[PDB]
């Protein structure tokens, strides 16, 4: 209402109302200066990437793909170097082509949610091969999204910690 839940001492941030993971946490009012849709999309994307990164950061230390079996680095932070710039760039460039494809060229803050994609639900790409979201209630869908967001936020904080841990400690996470 007039006061945010997360910050009971601060006025509730509007535009942060009725969203999936809203707890009223927007002390700096980014939701007013910038568009909510872009912000939502960004959060979800950051989260998904972080999730994967966290998992990979852990796995590489213990298991290596057959191709990279010869080169094994426990620090993980040193993996990027051992693999090579080309390999790293191949991944980033390929990501770019896929990003362009999915957003159909609307890859800028001024176009992502304009025109045909103006009605797109932030974070929705229609990717459900398993179809586990089949014939489910709206509530069920929403709860699932909440899970994704919460786990994503956790992953975002976790990955940073893992990387910086190795930097500070000097050795592998485990």
């Amino acid at each position: 209402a007039e006061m945010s839940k997360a910050m009971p001492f601060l006025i509730n941030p509007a535009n942060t109302d009725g969203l999936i993971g809203s707890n009223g946490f927007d002390p700096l009012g980014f939701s007013d200066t910038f568009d909510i849709k872009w912000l939502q999309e960004s959060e979800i994307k950051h989260g998904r990437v972080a999730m994967l990164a966290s998992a990979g950061f852990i796995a590489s230390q213990f298991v290596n793909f057959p191709m990279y079996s010869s080169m094994h680095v426990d620090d993980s932070n040193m993996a990027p170097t051992v693999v090579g710039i080309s390999a790293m760039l191949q991944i980033v460039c390929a990501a770019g082509v896929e990003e362009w494809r999915t957003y159909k060229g609307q890859v800028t803050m001024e176009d992502m949610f304009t025109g045909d994609m103006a009605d797109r639900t932030p974070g929705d790409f229609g990717f459900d091969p398993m179809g586990q979201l089949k014939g489910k209630s709206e509530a069920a869908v929403n709860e699932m999204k909440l899970k994704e967001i919460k786990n994503g936020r956790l992953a975002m904080l976790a990955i940073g910690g893992m990387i910086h841990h190795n930097f500070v400690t000097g050795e592998a996470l485990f």
Partner: protein
């Protein structure tokens, strides 16, 4: 004649409110230049820091210390802990977190001044103590804080000065 209770020989300062702890004690009338709410927040902040500081200073000197002590952090008095914490990095950690909180506080104070309705010093955490109680008791508790806060400032000031002036055990 609208005389300050604290100073029976002086007219009660205007611009003051009738809130808890208002005994008409503002001889220099700072309230005339600065909004009262800002001042009230400051008083609470200073006092709440001092109250906590006194406890910590005393306890460390008395002997209560974190068991897995860091490098050094032993054979060190409260008077000498600051530098040790700095080099260890504890002070940095504290400064970082404290500063972050102050940032959010800045946003809070502004809203309070703009009319959000936040009571100076109220952040919402009451532990349920104020839950259910009426204004009478609510105000009573607030007054008790205030009294403790003001007293605490005197206490901390004395402990620090005495200690440095006369290096010694907890009771200086």
């Amino acid at each position: 004649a609208e005389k300050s209770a604290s100073l029976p020989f002086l007219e009660a300062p205007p611009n003051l409110d009738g809130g808890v702890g208002d005994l008409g004690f503002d001889p220099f009338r700072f309230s005339d230049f600065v909004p009262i709410d800002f001042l009230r927040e400051a008083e609470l902040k200073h006092g709440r820091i001092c109250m906590m500081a006194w406890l910590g200073f005393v306890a460390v000197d008395m002997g209560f210390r974190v068991y897995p002590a860091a490098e050094g952090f032993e054979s060190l008095t409260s008077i000498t802990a600051h530098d040790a914490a700095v080099e260890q990095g504890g002070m940095s950690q504290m400064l970082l977190w404290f500063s972050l909180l102050e940032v959010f506080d800045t946003i809070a104070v502004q809203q309070m001044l703009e009319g959000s309705g936040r009571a100076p010093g109220d952040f919402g955490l009451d532990g349920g103590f104020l839950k259910g109680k009426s204004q009478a008791e609510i105000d009573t508790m607030k007054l008790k804080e205030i009294v403790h806060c003001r007293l605490a400032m005197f206490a901390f000031s004395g402990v620090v000065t005495q200690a440095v002036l006369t290096q010694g055990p907890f009771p200086y």
